[PDB]
Amino acid sequence: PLAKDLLHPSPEEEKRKHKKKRLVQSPNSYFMDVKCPGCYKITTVFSHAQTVVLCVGCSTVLCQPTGGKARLTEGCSFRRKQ
């Protein structure tokens, strides 16, 4: 109030502003890296994923789509990328 640095927001706060109203617009989703346990294979996936995605060889169903984020099937590890 009456004094704020609009130029230097706290990162804490900026995680909290809406994705278009940040000082520069930053996507809230990230590309993730999925591994189903029984397979060696690595898959790149979108964090908010429509359709449904597949590990080819095992016919393993990677994730169901939902409203916000895709929810991966159980036991399936993931790593956000950079």
């Binding site: 990162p11 900026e14 995680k15 520069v24 930053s26 950079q82």
Partner: protein
């Protein structure tokens, strides 16, 4: 290995191309360096007499230079000893069409070749091992400008000893005043 457009070679170009020849014979990169050429070169003064090498390459080869850029810089640096070598693509600036013109204007100039765009592809190129994060143009109470440029925080230890060299480079081609900051994070 140099192909100037004006067609006349120089004494800097001489030893620098020769350096690349030496890197074609003695280095693992031979094929790439055979394919590639450079159009031009310069030397400048920055940061208390410290010296910087500027290498102009033809545009379509640029994204190829980007492959070997770091190795090239190590080796070419140790060939030239202490200097800072930076690569910039050679850029056409098509003068702004006016009411007074001949026909040098038949087809319109593409946005790509234009003052602002070029200055930003230069800026883009200078920093290469670092991405650009965000750019902040600040204005002085004078009416003068300055440009803060934000860089990847991961590549920090890679480029952070250069910094003010860029600041000199950009100033000598472009003519604007630029500082470089590494943001805490997002």
């Amino acid at each position: 290995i140099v192909k100037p457009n004006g067609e006349k070679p120089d004494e800097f170009e001489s030893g620098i191309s020769q350096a690349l020849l030496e890197l074609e014979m003695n280095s693992d990169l031979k094929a790439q360096l055979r394919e590639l050429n450079i159009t031009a070169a310069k030397e400048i003064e920055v940061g208390g007499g410290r010296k910087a090498i500027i290498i102009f390459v033809p545009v379509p080869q640029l994204k190829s230079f980007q492959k070997i850029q770091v190795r090239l810089v190590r080796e070419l640096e140790k060939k030239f000893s202490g200097k800072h070598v930076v690569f910039i693509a050679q850029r056409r600036i098509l003068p702004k069409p006016t009411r007074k013109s001949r026909t040098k204007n038949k087809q319109k100039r593409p946005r790509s070749r234009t003052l602002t765009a070029v200055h930003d592809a230069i800026l883009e190129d200078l920093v290469f091992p670092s991405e650009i994060v965000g750019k902040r143009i600040r204005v002085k109470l004078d009416g003068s400008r300055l440009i803060k440029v934000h860089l990847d925080k991961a590549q920090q230890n890679n480029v952070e000893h250069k910094v003010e060299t860029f600041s000199g480079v950009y100033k000598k081609l472009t003519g604007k005043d630029v500082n470089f900051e590494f943001p805490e994070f997002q």
